Design a protein around this ligand. Structure first.
Ligand SMILES: Cc1cc(-c2ccc3nc(C4CCOCC4)n(CCOC(F)(F)F)c3c2)cn(C)c1=O
Length: 126
């Protein structure tokens, strides 16, 4: 079976809204989410559907943009670094699991190049 997805709401975890988190939702996530290659990354890796019985024996910290979108829209995060780390983990998971040269890796690398551009433009905290 698939594991439960990463949590997106937890009453015990404090949260805030900042201009950097709003930029991560309206600019960074929005740019990647609408990209032609977004869709393998728009929901948790479905190892059952994809017939990957080893995926969740290898990847300890799965992450995907559907999870990140909900985390931002429902204020799961305290700071922008947590969200940036989620994006970074999503990319490195892809590079750990897949063969170099697989199409999913080329897709990840195109999204990552855009992510890096957008994050360098992160606004000073207001
Ligand atoms: C290992 C891994 C896999 C994927 C990933 C995620 C979702 C995917 N949905 C499909 C197809 C399956 C058949 O029904 C139509 C959709 N593929 C297969 C085609 O993917 C491709 F287009 F990219 F080639 C999916 C693959 C996502 N990350 C992050 C992975 O590491």
């Amino acid at each position: 079976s698939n594991p439960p997805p990463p949590e997106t709401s937890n009453p015990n975890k404090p949260k805030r809204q900042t201009n950097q988190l709003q930029y991560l939702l309206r600019v960074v996530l929005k740019t990647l989410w609408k990209h032609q290659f977004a869709w393998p990354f728009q929901q948790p890796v479905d190892a059952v559907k994809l017939n990957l019985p080893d995926y969740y024996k290898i990847i300890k910290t799965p992450m995907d943009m559907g999870t990140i979108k909900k985390r931002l829209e429902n204020n799961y995060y305290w700071n922008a670094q947590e969200c940036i780390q989620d994006f970074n983990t999503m990319f490195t998971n892809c590079y750990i699991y897949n063969k170099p040269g697989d199409d999913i890796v080329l897709m990840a690398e195109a999204l990552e190049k855009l992510f890096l551009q957008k994050i360098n433009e992160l606004p000073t905290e207001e």
